[PDB]
Amino acid sequence: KIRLYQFLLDLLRSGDMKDSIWWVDKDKGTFQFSSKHKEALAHRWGIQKGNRKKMTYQKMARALRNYGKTGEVKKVKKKLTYQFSGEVLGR
DNA sequence: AATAAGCGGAATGGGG
DNA sequence: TCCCCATTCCGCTTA
């Protein structure tokens, strides 16, 4: 099954939910969620995963925080903004 | 206060 | 057995 970070990178590459997520500095791998439209993207993640409950942005961000130690995605000190690792972007 | 983002410990669930 | 990769629940903190 797809991993969360790859789901997000795939969306940014396809442009399919441009009102929910976007690059801030694509060369650096920084991206940002929409305050008003992030829940539709969270819903899509949960449905893709076949999870029992409806996915929320809060639960999705709880999973995102677990990448901080291994490095795939780190939180940036800007509202709703994160950064992929060079390894993730190169692969 | 109302609203929202940010945090993470802990329990629970996936699929090996 | 026991790690993978989350999901779900809950309470607190910061803006």
Provide structural commentary.
- This protein has 4 helices and 4 strands.
- By secondary structure, it is an alpha+beta fold.
- The chain has one domain.
- It has a 4-stranded antiparallel β-sheet.
- It starts with a helix and ends with a helix.
- The protein binds a DNA duplex (16 and 15 nucleotides) through residues 1, 3-4, 35, 46, 49, 51-53, 55, 57-63, 65-66, 75, 79-80.
- Belongs to the ETS family.
- It is found in: Nucleus.
- This is Transcription factor PU.1.
- DNA binds at residues 49, 62, 65, 75.
- Residues 2-85 bind DNA.
Give me some keywords for this one.
91 residues, alpha+beta, 4-stranded antiparallel beta sheet, 4 helices, globular, DNA-binding
SSE map:
Layout: H1 4-14, E1 21-25, E2 30-33, H2 38-49, H3 57-65, E3 73-75, E4 81-84, H4 86-90
Antiparallel strand pairs: 1-2, 2-4, 3-4
The structure holds a DNA duplex (16 and 15 nucleotides).
Family: Belongs to the ETS family.
Organism: Homo sapiens (Human)
Subcellular location: Nucleus
Separation, N- and C-terminal Cα atoms:
17 Å
Quaternary arrangement of the chains shown?
monomer
Care to count the β-strands?
Answer: 4
Separate helix tally? 4
PDB class: transcription/dna
Keywords: protein-DNA complex, ETS, PU.1, TRANSCRIPTION-DNA complex
Assembly: trimeric
Entry title: Human PU.1 ETS-Domain (165-270) Bound to d(AATAAGCGGAATGGGG)
Q: What would you say about this model in short?
A:
By secondary structure, this protein is an alpha+beta fold. The chain contains 4 helices and 4 strands; from the N terminus they run αββααββα.
